[PDB]
Amino acid sequence: VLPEDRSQHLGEELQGYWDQEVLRAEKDAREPSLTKAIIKCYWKSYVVLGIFTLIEESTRVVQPIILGKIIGYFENYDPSDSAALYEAHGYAGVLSACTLVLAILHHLYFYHVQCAGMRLRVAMCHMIYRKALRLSNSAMGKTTTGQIVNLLSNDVNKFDQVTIFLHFLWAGPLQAIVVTALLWMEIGISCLAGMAVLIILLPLQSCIGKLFSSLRSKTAAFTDTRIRTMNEVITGIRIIKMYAWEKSFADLITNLRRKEISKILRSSYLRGMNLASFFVASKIIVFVTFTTYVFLGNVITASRVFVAVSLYGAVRLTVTLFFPSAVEKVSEAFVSIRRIKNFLLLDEIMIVNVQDFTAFWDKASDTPTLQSLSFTVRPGELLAVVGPVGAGKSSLLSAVLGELPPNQGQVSVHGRIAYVSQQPWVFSGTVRSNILFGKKYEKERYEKVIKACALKKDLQLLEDGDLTMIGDRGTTLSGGQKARVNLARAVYQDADIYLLDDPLSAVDAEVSRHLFELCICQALHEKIRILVTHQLQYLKAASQILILKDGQMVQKGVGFKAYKNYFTAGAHWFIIIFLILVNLAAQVSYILQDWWLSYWANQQSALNTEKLDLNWYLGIYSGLTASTVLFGIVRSLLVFFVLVSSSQTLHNQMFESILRAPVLFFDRNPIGRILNRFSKDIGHMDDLLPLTYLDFIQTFLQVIGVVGVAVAVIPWIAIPLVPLGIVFFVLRRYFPVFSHLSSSLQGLWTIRAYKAEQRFQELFDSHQDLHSEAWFLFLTTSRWFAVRLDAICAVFVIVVAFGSLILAKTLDAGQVGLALSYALTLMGMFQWCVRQSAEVENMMISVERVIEYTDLEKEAPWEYQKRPLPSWPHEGVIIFDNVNFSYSLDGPLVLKHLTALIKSKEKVGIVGRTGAGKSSLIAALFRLSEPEGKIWIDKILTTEIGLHDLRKKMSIIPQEPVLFTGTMRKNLDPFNEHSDEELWNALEEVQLKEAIEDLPGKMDTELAESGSNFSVGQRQLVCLARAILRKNRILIIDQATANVDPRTDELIQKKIREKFAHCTVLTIAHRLNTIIDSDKIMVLDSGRLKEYDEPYVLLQNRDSLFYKMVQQLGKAEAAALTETAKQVYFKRNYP
Ligand SMILES: CCCCCCCCCCCCCCCCCCCC(=O)O[C@H](COC(=O)CCCCCCCCCCCCCC)COP(=O)(O)OCCN
Ligand SMILES: Nc1ncnc2c1ncn2[C@@H]1O[C@H](COP(=O)(O)OP(=O)(O)OP(=O)(O)O)[C@@H](O)[C@H]1O
Ligand SMILES: Nc1ncnc2c1ncn2[C@@H]1O[C@H](COP(=O)(O)OP(=O)(O)OP(=O)(O)O)[C@@H](O)[C@H]1O
Ligand SMILES: [Mg+2]
Ligand SMILES: [Mg+2]
């Protein structure tokens, strides 16, 4: 691609014009206008293209007048007049030349208009992503990932369209008055009856633009919420599967898709009426006129009638097709412009020192989120930030980071920030790539980071080392691995100010102090550090400590199978056969109406007072017209019905297939690869493909009509038609960005912290330039074929023109008028037919990409033919018998020979280093991959019942808390199976009631994207609230309180003891104080169960792993734990 067409030279041009308009609007006291910016940018390039229009359009309108001179040779033909035949060969010559001129002008126009659109689309995409990197937290509340995907996927694709047709808004009306002027000299006042139709149709067609834009806007809304819901399914699929919530999301998507389709059906009918107009309007017009002509007392004769029909034919495209499509495309596009505009207008964002600082995350809040803060920290000092869940600790880092601006007071910072976010940010690549983050590789400093971040061991267990591939969100890594990678990245950048948001809570006690001592103290020793932490064990190493409570400071110290499927998915084969019949019936009645004028002309020519019975000729002419109109309407609406019904059916199968795909599918496919189907491809199948099919079907049958008429009038045309057909056969025989966007929006504060924004912009522009080469290669190959197909068509028009004059002794004037009027329409229709063919064939790739996702590999059936009795589980015994587990068949085993019994009502702790396989045990139990060996739950094999039979009966609290966009009520109870008093009881028991009663909607409060209103500790408490509302014998807890402070933890621990007393409970926990009272503790290393015994019995073996683990916490910690273990063990031995 030339530099002038690159995504970063584009985009920067239009951003300049946008900024100028924004700057002028404030001087004008206006609101800015994006249309205006577009115009100012492009106009000089685009208005010139109208020259092509003007030349072509003028050349079309003279051809009928030349046709009148040759028809007027057959009419009153004298075979003596060799001089007249020589002149007639002259006029056929000029038609041959005009045909070639029109052919080159069509390609020159259509190429450039396409390019124009591509430019506009590419420039817009750049500006949208540039804006996304600048959005404030306020703006990120007013928009969502699904909207931005929608913007970049479907809204900007309107820009491809606009540029095509836009010159026809004046060429249409202009042609309509020119043809009328012309017609006046052929048929007199009678032509006025034709203008009487156009002065109706064209204003009606234009005035309908308000419908298109209102329908579009309405549609657009539902696409945003649908794509957003797909995004939170695809990123939430593990938690959705473990909860068995698939049916709730299916109902929600189905209703949004139903609302959305109701507007697509409306619009499609409008669209369909336009293409019916293209077919029938000309027939209406010539009927109206010639009825008037015969009522005023003229008689039908070949030269006047067929020049008039040909005149209409010369305008037909421009007026009847191109003009309405223009209004359509433009009124549709102004919505895209308004959508984009609104986006573009959204809000945009050595020492550390803070003074008098007060700030609000939302100005509607009654209370500040930080109040009267002052502190300062300087090189070599470590400041610990301590306090409850929701106290403001991450808010403090966001104040230093500049993401929460002061309402009063001030902040000043000098030096580069390194930000270690509370949720780890990990993106697709190798784990080496995630650590380097654009810095050069240098072995000595890199290996020092790998050991300092406690990461050397894990990388030696992996087969491909630090070059192992990682998924779009790190879903292939355990929690404490994605934490260590997130910290190792920060160390490698060698920044000046480190902002550490609870980096240690996802790792084991040994790895925790390894990171603190070797990374946070020793490696970063010379640097400013602010450490948000609950690990009170380390605070003695801090230079100063800040305690926050309640927001304030407390203290400081294409195959045919695809085509077959696409049509047959829409309707039963009877409707498809009927649809074929009305297509043929429309085109046959179309031809017979024009043959009837040819026949009427010949009868009038045969007469001598004698006159034709007008009741017969005008009667039959009326019938054939009404027949053509009737089938034209039915044919146009029925195609839209079948193909939208096909898109609706193929979507449902694709979505059902996705919900039954195994989690391995989502680990191996990028999120953007999936959203591309549901956003872009479904968009084309709904909006654009049905229209383009009907347009091709109409024009293709019209082309066949020309060849049929030409051969039927002049049989010897069949001789050259064989070579032309052979050449036609010879030619035919010879002839992701959304994952990057999603990653960028997740990492946005960290990307801004390191000032990586330019490098991220360059990646986006590089990706757009790749798609641009694919677009230019498609255009270049399509043009190469099109310019040769036109050479076949041009020869056909030439041999029918001259063949008429060679064979003239066999012809009659009405017959030549018929054959050549059709021939003159051929090439303009033939060109558009070939264009719409190429776009259909291109868009069928979208259909294949959708069909392949209808046929994904399936996770096992949700209900088998065998089902457990409703009493099951009735004891909650779980037996693991020689279990082995791997997340893929081609991959390593992560659990080996695992063999254990869990008794009824037993409480079991699960313990061991990061990456040991602890959460892998839950994935086996839930059959997220199918285990080897055997697992028995109350004497039923988990593998002999359906995936909802077991998953519904096991409560889970996952390692990652996921909340969904919606009400707080729906996040607790999506099925509406509980009363509000039960939800409030849950919210009291998880210490969260006051935090919800402060919200203005209370439980009807709408949560932001991914639950962003809440701190991470609060999102953990909501997952415990979900699990309290379910009622099951078996509960699984995975690190459910790791981000919850100790004084909140001891309360929810007490409630867990009280509420789940009758359950069998499995608890994975690094925070050993939460599990020291277990009945038995499993200790895992390297995927093996090494110890499984009573807590005190483990600790009295000084060579055990568990004795080492409690001892690593420190002497007072080990004393408290060993005492607690001894006490519970003695109490178990007293009875
Ligand atoms: C013998 C035939 C004689 C008549 C031929 C002309 C037909 C029009 C006659 C005027 C009376 C009929 C109604 C006119 C429109 C009324 C206002 C509603 C417009 C509307 O709903 O649709 C518009 C679509 O474009 C349009 O509707 C565009 C219509 C353009 C008409 C001709 C303009 C000539 C100049 C073109 C210059 C092009 C230069 C290109 C380089 C804009 O949609 P919206 O309102 O929803 O959008 C913003 C949403 N927020
Ligand atoms: N992006 C946000 N938008 C609006 N409110 C927020 C946002 N993030 C946090 N809050 C609110 O600000 C207050 C403090 O949240 P904050 O995240 O600072 O708590 P925290 O100290 O990080 O708790 P944790 O220990 O779980 O990290 C809470 O009331 C929380 O609901
Ligand atoms: N989706 C996955 N696909 C393939 N392998 C995975 C996947 N998730 C985790 N692993 C591998 O599984 C092993 C164990 O991961 P697991 O989550 O069971 O460790 P863990 O005990 O939960 O560590 P943590 O204390 O951080 O929770 C890891 O070493 C990792 O290599
Ligand atoms: Mg926090
Ligand atoms: Mg885990």
Tab-separated table of N, CA and C and ligand atoms in Angstrom, residues 238 462 475-481 506 667 887 894 912-920 959 1038-1039 1070, ligand 3:
chain	number	residue	atom	x	y	z
A	238	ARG	N	-16.094	-19.932	31.912
A	238	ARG	CA	-15.818	-20.852	33.018
A	238	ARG	C	-16.808	-20.713	34.173
A	462	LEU	N	7.562	-26.208	32.698
A	462	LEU	CA	6.975	-26.065	31.370
A	462	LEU	C	7.892	-26.619	30.282
A	475	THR	N	-5.695	-17.169	30.647
A	475	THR	CA	-6.532	-18.251	31.158
A	475	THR	C	-5.796	-19.583	31.225
A	476	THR	N	-4.655	-19.708	30.549
A	476	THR	CA	-3.794	-20.884	30.621
A	476	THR	C	-2.863	-20.899	31.831
A	477	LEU	N	-2.878	-19.879	32.683
A	477	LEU	CA	-1.994	-19.796	33.841
A	477	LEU	C	-2.798	-19.766	35.134
A	478	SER	N	-2.216	-20.331	36.188
A	478	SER	CA	-2.768	-20.208	37.528
A	478	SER	C	-2.680	-18.774	38.036
A	479	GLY	N	-3.446	-18.497	39.089
A	479	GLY	CA	-3.560	-17.134	39.584
A	479	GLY	C	-2.242	-16.533	40.032
A	480	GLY	N	-1.477	-17.269	40.832
A	480	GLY	CA	-0.182	-16.780	41.273
A	480	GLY	C	0.891	-16.743	40.209
A	481	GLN	N	0.686	-17.389	39.065
A	481	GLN	CA	1.586	-17.203	37.931
A	481	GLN	C	1.327	-15.888	37.206
A	506	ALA	N	-2.066	-13.610	45.851
A	506	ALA	CA	-2.296	-14.804	45.042
A	506	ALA	C	-1.226	-15.890	45.172
A	667	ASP	N	-9.881	-21.236	25.248
A	667	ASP	CA	-8.452	-21.067	25.490
A	667	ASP	C	-7.629	-21.043	24.208
A	887	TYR	N	-5.472	-30.716	30.582
A	887	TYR	CA	-6.404	-29.764	29.995
A	887	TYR	C	-6.579	-29.964	28.499
A	894	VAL	N	-1.422	-32.543	34.552
A	894	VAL	CA	-1.240	-31.661	35.706
A	894	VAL	C	-1.655	-32.310	37.025
A	912	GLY	N	-0.880	-26.000	49.075
A	912	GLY	CA	0.341	-26.209	48.312
A	912	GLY	C	0.704	-25.006	47.463
A	913	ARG	N	1.947	-25.034	46.965
A	913	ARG	CA	2.554	-23.961	46.174
A	913	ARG	C	1.703	-23.550	44.976
A	914	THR	N	1.929	-22.341	44.465
A	914	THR	CA	1.307	-21.900	43.223
A	914	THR	C	1.645	-22.840	42.069
A	915	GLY	N	0.649	-23.121	41.228
A	915	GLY	CA	0.830	-24.037	40.119
A	915	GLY	C	0.883	-25.499	40.490
A	916	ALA	N	0.607	-25.846	41.744
A	916	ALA	CA	0.655	-27.240	42.164
A	916	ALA	C	-0.438	-28.108	41.552
A	917	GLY	N	-1.501	-27.523	41.009
A	917	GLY	CA	-2.641	-28.289	40.541
A	917	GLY	C	-3.901	-28.167	41.376
A	918	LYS	N	-3.969	-27.216	42.310
A	918	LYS	CA	-5.098	-27.150	43.235
A	918	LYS	C	-6.413	-26.855	42.519
A	919	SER	N	-6.463	-25.792	41.718
A	919	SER	CA	-7.673	-25.531	40.943
A	919	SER	C	-7.889	-26.571	39.854
A	920	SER	N	-6.827	-27.226	39.389
A	920	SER	CA	-6.984	-28.334	38.451
A	920	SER	C	-7.816	-29.473	39.024
A	959	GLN	N	-11.841	-18.805	41.995
A	959	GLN	CA	-10.631	-18.036	42.293
A	959	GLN	C	-10.679	-16.624	41.714
A	1038	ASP	N	-12.482	-21.710	46.413
A	1038	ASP	CA	-11.126	-21.503	45.895
A	1038	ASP	C	-10.615	-20.085	46.175
A	1039	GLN	N	-9.856	-19.920	47.267
A	1039	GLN	CA	-9.199	-18.650	47.619
A	1039	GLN	C	-10.183	-17.484	47.729
A	1070	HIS	N	-4.308	-20.312	50.458
A	1070	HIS	CA	-2.939	-19.991	50.862
A	1070	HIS	C	-2.869	-19.418	52.273
B	3	LIG	N1	-6.336	-23.395	30.964
B	3	LIG	C1	-5.172	-24.122	31.107
B	3	LIG	N2	-4.705	-24.821	30.090
B	3	LIG	C2	-3.597	-25.515	30.203
B	3	LIG	N3	-2.899	-25.554	31.312
B	3	LIG	C3	-3.292	-24.882	32.379
B	3	LIG	C4	-4.461	-24.126	32.314
B	3	LIG	N4	-4.630	-23.554	33.528
B	3	LIG	C5	-3.654	-23.903	34.309
B	3	LIG	N5	-2.792	-24.703	33.635
B	3	LIG	C6	-1.607	-25.353	34.176
B	3	LIG	O1	-2.132	-26.014	35.341
B	3	LIG	C7	-1.144	-26.034	36.373
B	3	LIG	C8	-1.827	-25.911	37.727
B	3	LIG	O2	-2.639	-24.749	37.626
B	3	LIG	P1	-3.508	-24.586	38.951
B	3	LIG	O3	-4.448	-23.495	38.656
B	3	LIG	O4	-4.202	-25.959	39.368
B	3	LIG	O5	-2.391	-24.129	39.990
B	3	LIG	P2	-2.976	-23.625	41.386
B	3	LIG	O6	-2.768	-24.602	42.466
B	3	LIG	O7	-4.526	-23.260	41.242
B	3	LIG	O8	-2.047	-22.342	41.635
B	3	LIG	P3	-2.725	-21.131	42.425
B	3	LIG	O9	-2.206	-21.151	43.940
B	3	LIG	O10	-2.203	-19.791	41.728
B	3	LIG	O11	-4.197	-21.165	42.364
B	3	LIG	C9	-0.322	-24.761	36.150
B	3	LIG	O12	1.036	-25.033	36.489
B	3	LIG	C10	-0.459	-24.451	34.650
B	3	LIG	O13	0.755	-24.839	34.018
